């Protein structure tokens, strides 16, 4: 239970070692304006994503951060967001827990 992959295709995405307790918890449950609930796990680092467009602060769930949609770079599945423009840390990833599969390195 050491690396996280895209559930839909297997792409390598992150690692348990890279979980980041933001505001004291690595897990944050949030909703967008369309009412969709997301169980977000914060990671300091991720790979294999494709970050879409330019950042936006609108509706940001993390104070001081602007976001970009993060797709699986391989299959296009929406895996979460990349956050930037903030402080301590400047950047991080918020990934949707149930869209990842955990398993051995």
- Binding positions for Ca(2+) are 25, 27
Give 42 or 49: the residue with its C-beta nearer to Zn ion.
Answer: 49
Closest distance to Zn ion from the beta carbon of 57 (Å):
27
Which residue is it, tokens 């423009």?
85
CB of 22 to Zn ion, least distance (A): 24
Shortest distance in whole angstroms from residue 89 CB to Zn ion:
25
Residues of this chain that interact with Zn ion (CB under 5 A) are 6, 8-9, 11, 72, 74-75, 77
Q: What is the DSSP secondary structure assignment for residue 67, as one 8-state letter?
A: E
Strand segments (E) across the chain: 3-6, 12-15, 27-31, 37-43, 49-56, 66-72, 78-84, 92-96, 100-103
Residue number, 11 or 60, with CB nearest to Zn ion: 11
Binding residues: 6, 9, 25, 27, 72, 75
User: Whole-angstrom Cα distance, residue 12 to residue 28?
Assistant: 22
Residue 52 vs residues 21, 24, 27, 102: alpha-carbon distances, Å: 25, 28, 23, 24
* Identity of the residue, 40 or 73, whose beta carbon is nearer to Zn ion in the bound complex: 73
């Amino acid at each position: 239970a050491s690396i996280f992959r895209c559930r839909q295709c297997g792409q390598t995405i992150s690692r348990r070692d890279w979980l980041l307790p933001m505001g004291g918890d690595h897990e944050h449950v949030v909703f967008n304006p369309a009412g969709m609930i997301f169980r977000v796990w914060c990671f300091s680092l991720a790979q294999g994503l494709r970050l879409i467009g330019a950042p936006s602060g609108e509706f940001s769930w993390f104070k001081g951060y602007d976001w970009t949609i993060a797709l699986c770079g391989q299959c296009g599945s929406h895996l979460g967001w990349h956050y930037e423009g903030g402080s301590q840390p400047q950047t991080f990833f918020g990934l949707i827990k149930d869209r990842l599969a955990e398993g051995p390195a």
